[PDB]
């Protein structure tokens, strides 16, 4: 079902030029050297410095034309506060245990740096990012 | 007088919530539908 789970602490929140988009940098509590850079929508999911986020990555939401979800049906997204859908445009096989995954959620960019052991399963075309706080 | 003056910050049932509570109502509903109503 899911491909990756972890808990991060936000080191920095960079608003920059934009009013609705912020770039956050986080590091996994359990396993260091696993970094996360992510663009999020401030209005619908505001985050502050030193917050704790539960980030989950999945290739599907189950338990081609989009339609508004019926209230009756249920999906993985019901457990989280913020869900995005993107495409992986670069899977970098770099150093011995340095793997970078670049995802683009409609122009909102994410880079997940980590080891091959954790990120081996992230070699997909599309990914969902589910965030809980 | 001590018992009247004493107040406890968190309740006996609510002690598992603490500073961050979470809801498992869906988990309870699934447990009821799949254990008590299990066939």
């Amino acid at each position: 079902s899911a491909l990756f789970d972890d808990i991060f602490t936000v080191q920095t929140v960079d608003n920059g030029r934009y009013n609705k988009v912020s770039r956050i940098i986080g590091i996994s509590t359990t396993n260091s050297a696993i970094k996360l850079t992510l663009d999020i929508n401030n209005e619908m999911f505001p985050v502050s410095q030193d917050d704790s986020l539960t980030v989950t990555l999945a290739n599907s939401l189950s338990l081609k034309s989009w339609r508004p979800p019926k209230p009756t049906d249920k999906s993985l997204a019901d457990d989280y506060d913020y869900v995005m859908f993107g495409t992986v445009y670069k899977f970098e096989e770099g150093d011995e245990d340095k793997i970078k995954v670049y995802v683009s959620f409609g122009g909102l960019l994410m880079c997940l740096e980590g080891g091959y052991k954790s990120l081996a399963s992230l070699k997909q075309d599309n990914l969902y990012i589910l965030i809980r706080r | 007088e001590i018992a009247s003056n004493e107040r406890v910050l968190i309740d006996h049932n609510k002690v598992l919530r603490g500073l961050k509570p979470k809801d498992f109502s869906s988990v309870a509903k699934d447990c009821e539908l799949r254990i008590l109503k299990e066939k």
Partner: protein, 465 residues
């Protein structure tokens, strides 16, 4: 209304009454401790020298919940200093309360001063219950639960106290086999507590559910009737957990028991979801151990390895042998199902470290089994996928495993029968050793052929030049 009152007073430049801030802090106690602490600090700043013992004590407790040990200690010291100005009627009660709080801070810091203040308060006021509970709990920790008489006496003193009964049940669950008491004695105690005192106590219900789950798990299954009785015990435990959830749907332990029952019922997905939610809620050693177990049942061996490693580093600090056993088992499973040699090497190294920490026959047999599997896997591998060094290490491990099998067969009570050990050692020594030597010879021939080709090519190149 209080926020509007504060805003109107600020616009009118009028002195804000600190009582409104105290009421706001009391209301926010059940909603937001941060806002309550901020309002209490504002009230203290407004009062200045008019600060009372209650405000300082609540500030100290707020910083204690905020893990601000230094600030909590300073606020408690200021409260103790201001205690001298208390009216004599409530002076004894407030002194007892402040001494209890100071003893709690000591119990966090150093147990000796906590025991001293506990003895002082017990002589001052024997009727208080929390003091006796904490003192007997520290005595049980120091004496490794050799004070069952004290626990029984405390139970007799306050049979109607829910806290005393819960502590007594916790002591029973901790040292029932050590004290040789009845298995169902705690069950009858919790049943009496629920029937006669309070049927909505989640602690006794969870204790009964755990006891019933243990009884069902230890119950032998022989036919459909025994399975039905075990399912009935699990249904009783699930009814206890569902009653707990009805009392409070935010109970992590009830969900944990439900997930354990689902794991016993092989409902791996629901247990995995519940354990992930629990890990998101709270992070202790047990949650990580259950997550690793579920990942092993869910065949996600890499996530199990990560979960066990995080558990060991966070809590066990590389000292517990059981987590090392789990790490070795997970690595062996990943290596077996994925045909990876490095997983076998890591499992062997972890098992060797665990044995050097313990030196037990079970880990000796684990090392022997791991080395036998290593030799079998290397022999099954082609020549192009292995080298001479791996063959030599596998052969040496095979020799050490055969010697250790002979050693285990000479023991008093080995984990497996000595006949099986001798038969497996003979079966390995007859065939696997010779197959390893043939593999070594083939690998040597392959390397020699490569070197012959490499040396012959260069001479022809030089002749052409």
């Amino acid at each position: 209304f209080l926020e509007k009152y504060v805003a109107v007073c600020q616009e009118e430049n009028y002195p804000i009454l600190p009582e409104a801030y105290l009421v706001l802090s009391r209301v926010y106690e059940n909603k937001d401790l941060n806002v309550a602490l901020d309002y209490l600090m504002k009230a203290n700043d407004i009062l200045g020298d008019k600060a009372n013992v209650y405000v300082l004590n609540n500030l100290g407790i707020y910083h204690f919940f905020r893990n601000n040990v230094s600030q909590s200690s300073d606020f408690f010291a200021q409260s103790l200093e201001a205690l001298n100005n208390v009216s004599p009627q409530n002076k004894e009660a407030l002194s007892i309360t402040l001494h209890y709080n100071k003893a709690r801070v000591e119990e966090v810091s150093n147990q000796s001063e906590a025991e001293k203040l506990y003895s002082k308060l017990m002589e001052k006021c024997p009727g208080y219950t929390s003091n006796k509970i904490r003192y007997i709990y520290l005595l049980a920790l120091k004496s490794n639960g050799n004070n069952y008489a004290d626990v029984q006496q405390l139970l007799d003193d306050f049979p109607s106290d829910l806290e005393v009964r819960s502590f007594y049940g916790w002591f029973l669950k901790r040292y029932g086999r050590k004290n040789g008491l009845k298995q169902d004695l705690e069950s009858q105690h919790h049943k009496d507590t629920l029937i006669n005192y309070d049927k909505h106590d989640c602690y006794a219900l969870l204790s009964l559910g755990n006891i019933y789950a243990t009884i069902a798990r230890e119950m032998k299954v022989t036919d459909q009737k025994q399975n039905e009785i075990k399912r009935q015990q699990y249904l009783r435990a699930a009814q206890f957990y569902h009653k707990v959830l009805s009392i409070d749907p935010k109970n992590i332990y009830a969900a944990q028991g439900i997930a354990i029952i689902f794991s016993d019922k092989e409902r791996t997905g629901l247990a995995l979801e519940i354990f992930k939610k629990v890990r998101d809620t709270v992070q202790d050693l047990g949650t990580f151990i259950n997550l690793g177990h579920c990942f092993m049942e869910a065949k996600q061996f890499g996530k199990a390895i990560e979960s066990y490693t995080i558990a060991l580093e966070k809590f066990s600090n590389g000292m517990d042998s059981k987590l090392l056993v789990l790490i070795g088992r997970a690595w062996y499973h990943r290596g077996f199902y994925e045909k990876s040699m490095d997983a076998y090497k890591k499992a062997l190294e972890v098992s060797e470290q665990a044995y050097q920490l313990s030196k037990l026959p079970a880990l000796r047999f684990n090392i022997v089994f791991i080395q036998f599997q290593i030799a079998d896997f290397v022999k099954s591998l082609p020549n192009t996928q292995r080298d001479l060094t791996t063959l030599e290490n596998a052969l040496s491990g095979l020799n050490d495993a055969i010697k250790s099998l002979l050693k285990l067969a000479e023991l008093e009570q080995p984990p497996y029968p000595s006949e099986d050990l001798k038969a497996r050692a003979t079966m390995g020594s007859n065939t696997l050793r010779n197959q390893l030597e043939r593999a070594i010879q083939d690998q040597q021939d392959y390397e020699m052929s490569i070197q012959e080709k490499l040396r012959t090519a260069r001479r022809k190149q030089q002749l052409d030049e």
